[PDB]
Ligand binder design. Structure first.
Ligand code: PMR
Ligand code: SF4
Ligand SMILES: [Cu+2]
Ligand SMILES: [Mg+2]
Ligand SMILES: [Mg+2]
Lengths: 420, 401, 287, 290
């Protein structure tokens, strides 16, 4: 009932559609009203997808109520199977669907299609988009990921990377190249590059890698007991986090660390003499949980900045948020409202703030240098150039991405003082 | 072809995005879930960063379980937002899918809200949800909602109705004064600075084709529409102003001679881009009910060959002059399943495709050039000045491959 | 009009209790009055089921916060404690931050009693089960067991019956326990009226089996599941913070474990649940 | 009508009868542990006031027969104290015709065994409070007793403490006790806004030598009173037949009935409130704690 003008997330069916479009051979049926069909725009355009998202919508109207909704849903699923031919199918509901007495699971059972189906119960008014992605992930995992004999060579599974993710296409590549660095083979990358066969083979890994918590943590814990699959706890964003993750995976797989420091340049450039003025610069961080945790760690340790403001809209990870904030002796700001964080950056007045698009634009209003380090972004944040946020290369990317606003403002001020 | 197998359109809440641009004294409270908020936010894009007038209060479980709770929360929230924006006077309680399924009576709530707020601040509501309307129906629903509140006028005045960019409105006023006869009253008046009296006296003409409920709203007052081709392209605007002249008894010679230079500039501008789109095939998809006028303009002025024209709903009573100007070539269609029209698109091999943005990139990957109809509502394409730019919007001489 | 008042029978007849009947796994709610062993029986039942190989989670709806305490051996921070540590937003909790494991990997949850003088026990257990669904622990587990105070069986107190597929009861020879079991059968029938909860049967309280409870079961059309007296062999003080089925062995221990194993396998089968009745209070042979 | 809020607006579970702080008539509640926990204290104390000259509305609130049936001899002799009826009365709604006139004083009854089943304790005993009020029994009597048990701590269900002012305590000498008395103390200062229900002191029955639980009771800032009894109580069968005031005065260790009278000498309105406090599980630990 609170007025929101800009929200940091989407309805949980958006995250479920993220995981659905990430992996191939799936189709996603919405019990969505006509006009709620917009949700494929963002996928076709913000992420710049050449293919239609594997989704079909019933698009019911005022004339279609009661039984007509059920018949329309049945026809939608039947035609989706007939013309799209998905290896795996799942049934979902929208915000309006659950209010109507339409049983998605009952309709799916009545269809009795040969391809296995799963019923996604989405609390579209209790929860948000990342939860929906995670629930779809664990539900598909229990549907068609069964325990089976280990691989000949130690294998890992990357859990977490979904569509509409921050750089996810690049983090999968960087992590994969690193793991080939120790030579451990990635059996399946899900849900970014998954398939029904891939989910079936997901149990073949000797351990799991939690590349993104918000979208793979519950799947990893489900594999913990269902498949006896250990999952790594450390996120490799930043040099120190990269080394911690390398040690963790080397321990789990039993292979030697064999880390490659050749391409890394961030420590030398941060210790470089031109980078002295970065020391003692206040920074405010907001956005995705692990992203903010790693950003604060990287800033305080390797950047010389002083974290002056910490926050997270991922309420489900407020506990790590609070723990880290206490670790830096800060006060976690878990608001999902742009106005509270706006007031926070007004009161604190950090030299630089790194959040998401909201933080970028409020800093533009406040005349403060800003960079984006979180999920909610416009089209231009997602680049064609490969920009990993994690790993040794990701260290340099993070470094100069943070540098750019600072040097821009600094040279602008130097110009202004100089023509005066 | 009215198959309902699968539809890909926008809620009428997309009308709020540019509708508020016409009146900067209109605040919109959306009783919608997180999904409608996400739609408005995404589609607006850079707006949300400039503090729009779109208040999309999420229907949490708390106020959705009951009914009167949301009713009282509505009053509390509007009092709040009036406190935030003292400048704001006109309020709109736009309908949304959760409100429709829970059957929240927005009419009585808006009436009591206006009663308690007083004459200074006035709230009228409508429903722009996708359950009963779609895309452009939100705007004519809104204005038809504010039509009865407009007082009856006893003076015969030339009437313009339809949300329109301010420069286009100014140029239309200038042209109709260059005609000499016919006082212009802008129904979507800028921030309600001049409450436009509408009654039986004021016969009206239509500038925006999609305005369906508008005609009903003005027939309730007694105003009658005049058969006039919609002002798209130089000849469309010319025949439109000719119709206005005919209604107000303006001499044919006078209006022909008066508007000679503007239409000379317009034909120059349109011929600047006509050569790009000569001898090609086009396919139209149901996006904003703006497609038949576009097909007419392209076919007769730009030399376009229109294979198909897809419209969600045809108001033939007002689109009749458009159809008469339109050739028999393109097949008319009232609402086509997206997969069926996609199959016809694949069969037809359209050199240019007009559709929603969501379909656009898949067709581009399939190898068909796409022009998204979500754009043309924003950019000014509506008169002589923009007659050339209308064709330029469909030029797309990319040919990188 | 005084009885109906403004609400009166309102909250108890209309919207009496929210349904949310999503079980998935087999549910057996143990119901005893007190003194008669419900929590110890439930804990040993969970241990026997874990011995069998079925994943078991126990919900300690009792407000004394000791039902599942024995399996862990250490006092479990109850759900309401964490829900108050958080700002009553159920999403920052994660598994193993409110649930805890016991012997042989027995999951166990304690439902913290509602604050004194306000709230509802049914409210509390509803939040526990909702939080339980949110992190989907029921999905992996195969057996779900409820331990609730059967002394009071009002609407909120009857919420676990809504979930429970079978309703296990424990009883002693004391006449208070007799009236308690009678009330329990009546309330379980009432809860099986709306949706369904079946009656698995009653066990003794290790005082003396089949002394008069068997005849009462025959009269009420109930059944008397066998259980043996081990009052002194099983230390009243949870045997050094540690139940018998968990961290001990002895002839009496072995045979009691065997009895609980029979109870476990019978509940796992759990066919032909009896449909008993509540024999009139006057008809009750009394003293 | 109140559709939401009854189980909505945060699932509010008040009795939904506004404020129930008003005492019936100087209500003197008596806590217990469900029949076996000496619920006869309510009946015996009501008989004490009645012998003094103050009529008592001693409301036992015991589904089984231990609380007030001792005062009223045979259990529900007309089965109209059962209190559960569609017409809200199993007989004529006249206050005099309604139930029995106890056996001393003027009139007094308990709660029977209600098959009401479905419903929060906010109404199960919440309604059970006011049928005596419905026929103005709290007005027809001089003083009142509102017996409760160890299970009842929670509000709505703790409507007797909503209406109680000056109450004595009864409890055991085990872990269940040290849990129950302090939890009841918590309940009664939760009902302290409901006419400050008192905390006079506990009739604690040490089994053999459980002086450590009594020391804990002292640590709860809470008096001991009837320290002497060692699992020895008056004749149970005769107690079921009639309460001690009507039955042979068979004191077990000390002058039990004379101790009751010595208590009542100031307890006619209520024994001097020791004013105890609830205590956590860390300090109230009973070492192992069963
Ligand atoms: C719900 C659909 C949607 C989304 C996700 C966006 C964001 C977006 N708005 Mg297009 N905007 C949508 C529809 C609309 N936007 C609007 C504003 C707008 C304009 C003028 C433009 C634009 C564009 C975009 C873009 C760039 C990708 C795209 O083409 O959709 C996104 C993600 C951009 C474009 O179409 O490509 C050149 C462009 O010129 N947004 C308007 C007002 C007319 C509507 C109805
Ligand atoms: S279930 Fe009944 S007795 Fe228990 S707290 Fe709720 S209302 Fe009170
Ligand atoms: Cu820049
Ligand atoms: Mg217990
Ligand atoms: Mg007695």
């Amino acid at each position: 009932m609170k007025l929101t003008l800009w929200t940091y997330e989407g309805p949980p069916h958006v995250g479920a559609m993220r995981v659905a479009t990430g992996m191939t051979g799936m189709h996603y049926v919405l019990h969505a009203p006509q006009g709620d069909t917009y949700a494929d725009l963002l996928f076709t355009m913000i992420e710049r997808r050449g293919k239609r998202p594997p989704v079909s919508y019933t698009t019911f109207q005022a004339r279609d109520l009661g039984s007509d909704t059920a018949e329309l849903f049945q026809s939608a699923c039947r035609d989706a199977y007939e013309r799209f031919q998905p290896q795996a199918i799942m049934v979902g509901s929208s915000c309006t669907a659950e209010l109507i007495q339409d049983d998605t699971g009952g309709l799916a059972d009545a269809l009795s299609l040969p391809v296995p189906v799963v019923h996604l119960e989405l609390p579209s008014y209790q929860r948000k988009e990342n939860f929906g992605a995670d629930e779809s992930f664990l539900q598909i995992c229990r549907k068609l990921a069964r325990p089976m004999e280990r691989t000949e060579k130690v294998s890992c599974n990357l859990l977490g990377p979904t569509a509409l993710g921050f750089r996810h296409r690049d983090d999968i590549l960087e992590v994969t190249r690193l793991l080939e660095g120790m030579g451990i083979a990635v059996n399946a990358v899900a849900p970014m590059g998954a398939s029904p066969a891939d989910i079936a083979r997901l149990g073949a890994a000797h351990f799991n890698v939690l590349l993104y918590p918000e979208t793979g943590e519950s799947a990893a814990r489900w594999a913990e007991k269902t498949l006896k699959q250990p999952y790594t706890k450390t996120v490799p964003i930043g040099v120190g986090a990269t080394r911690d993750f390398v040690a963790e995976v080397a321990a789990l797989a039993g292979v030697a660390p064999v880390a490659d420091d050749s391409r890394l340049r961030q420590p030398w450039w941060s210790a470089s003499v031109d980078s002295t003025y970065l020391t003692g610069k206040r920074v405010f961080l907001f956005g995705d949980a692990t992203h903010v945790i790693a950003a604060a760690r990287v800033a305080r340790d390797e950047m010389g900045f002083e974290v002056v403001g910490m926050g997270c809209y991922n309420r489900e990870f407020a506990r790590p948020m609070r723990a880290a904030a206490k670790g830096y002796g800060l006060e976690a700001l878990v608001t999902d409202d742009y106005l509270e964080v706006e007031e926070a950056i007004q009161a604190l007045a950090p030299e630089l703030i790194l959040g998401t698009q909201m933080e970028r634009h409020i800093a533009k209003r406040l005349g403060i240098p800003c960079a984006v380090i979180s999920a909610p972004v416009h089209v231009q944040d997602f680049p064609a150039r490969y920009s990993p946020q994690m790993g040794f290369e990701g260290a340099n990317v993070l470094f100069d991405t943070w540098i750019h606003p600072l040097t821009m403002g600094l040279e602008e001020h130097l110009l202004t003082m100089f023509r005066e | 072809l009215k198959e309902r197998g699968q539809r890909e359109v926008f809620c009428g809440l997309t009308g709020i995005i540019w509708l508020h641009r016409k009146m900067q004294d209109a605040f919109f409270l959306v009783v919608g879930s997180r999904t409608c908020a996400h739609l408005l936010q995404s589609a607006a894009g850079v707006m949300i960063f400039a503090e729009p007038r779109f208040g999309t209060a999420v229907l949490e479980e708390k106020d959705l379980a009951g009914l009167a709770d949301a009713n009282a929360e509505l009053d509390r929230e509007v009092d709040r937002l009036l406190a935030r924006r003292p400048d704001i006077r006109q309020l709109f309680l736009v309908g949304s899918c959760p409100s429709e399924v829970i059957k929240l009576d927005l009419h009585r709530a808006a009436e009591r809200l206006s009663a308690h707020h007083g004459p200074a601040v006035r709230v009228y509501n409508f429903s722009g949800s996708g359950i009963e309307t779609t895309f452009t129906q939100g705007e004519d629903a809104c204005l038809a909602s504010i039509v009865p509140t407009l007082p009856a006028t006893e003076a015969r005045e030339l009437l313009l109705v339809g949300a329109l960019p301010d420069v286009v409105e100014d140029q239309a006023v200038s042209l109709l004064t260059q005609l000499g006869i016919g006082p212009v009253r802008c129904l979507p008046a800028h921030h309600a600075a001049e409450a436009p009296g509408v009654g039986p006296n004021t016969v009206f003409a239509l500038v925006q084709p999609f305005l369906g409920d508008t005609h009903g709203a003005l027939t309730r007052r007694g105003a009658r529409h005049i058969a006039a081709p919609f002002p798209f392209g130089e000849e469309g605007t010319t025949l439109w102003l000719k119709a206005i002249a005919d209604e107000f008894g303006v001499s044919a010679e006078t209006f022909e001679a008066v508007t000679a230079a503007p239409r000379a500039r317009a034909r120059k501008a349109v011929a600047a881009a006509s050569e790009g789109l000569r001898g090609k095939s086009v396919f139209f998809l149901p996006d904003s009910q703006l497609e038949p006028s576009l097909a007419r303009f392209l076919t007769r002025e730009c030399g376009m060959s229109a294979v198909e024209v897809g419209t969600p709903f045809l108001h033939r009573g007002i689109l009749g002059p458009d159809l008469d100007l339109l050739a028999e070539g393109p097949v008319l269609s009232e609402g086509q399943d997206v997969e069926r029209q996609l199959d016809r698109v694949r069969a037809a091999r359209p050199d240019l495709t007009v559709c929603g943005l969501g379909l656009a990139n898949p067709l581009e990957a399939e190898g068909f050039t796409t022009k998204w109809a979500i754009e043309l509502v924003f950019t000014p394409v509506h008169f002589y000045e923009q007659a050339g730019d209308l064709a330029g919007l469909f030029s797309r001489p990319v040919r990188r491959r | 009009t005084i009885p109906t008042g403004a609400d009166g029978e309102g909250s108890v007849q209309v919207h009496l209790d929210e349904a949310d009947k999503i079980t998935g796994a087999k549910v057996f709610a143990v119901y005893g009055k007190g003194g008669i062993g419900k929590s110890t029986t439930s804990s040993n039942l969970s241990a026997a089921f874990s011995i069998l190989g079925k994943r078991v989670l126990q919900i300690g709806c009792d407000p004394k916060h000791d039902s599942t305490f024995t399996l862990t051996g250490s006092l479990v921070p109850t759900v309401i404690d964490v829900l108050k540590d958080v700002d009553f937003h159920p999403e920052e909790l994660r598994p193993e931050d409110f649930v805890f494991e016991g012997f042989n990997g027995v999951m166990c949850v304690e439902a913290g009693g509602p604050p004194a003088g306000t709230g509802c026990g049914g409210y509390v257990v509803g939040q526990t089960v909702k939080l339980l669904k949110q992190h989907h622990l029921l999905d992996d587990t195969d057996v779900v067991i409820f331990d609730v105070l059967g002394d009071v069986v009002c609407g909120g107190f009857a919420a676990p019956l809504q979930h429970a597929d079978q309703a296990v009861v424990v009883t002693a020879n004391d006449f208070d326990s007799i009236y308690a079991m009678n009330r329990i059968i009546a309330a379980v029938q009432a809860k099986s009226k709306n949706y369904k909860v079946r009656l698995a049967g009653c066990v003794a309280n290790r005082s003396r089996a089949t002394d008069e409870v068997d005849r009462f079961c025959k009269e009420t059309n109930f059944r008397r599941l066998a259980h043996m007296p081990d009052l002194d062999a099983i230390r009243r003080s949870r045997l050094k913070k540690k139940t018998l089925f968990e961290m001990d062995e002895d002839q009496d221990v072995l045979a009691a474990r065997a009895e609980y194993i029979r109870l476990a396998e019978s509940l796992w089968r759990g066919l032909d649940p009896i449909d008993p009745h509540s024999l009139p209070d006057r008809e009750i042979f009394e003293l």
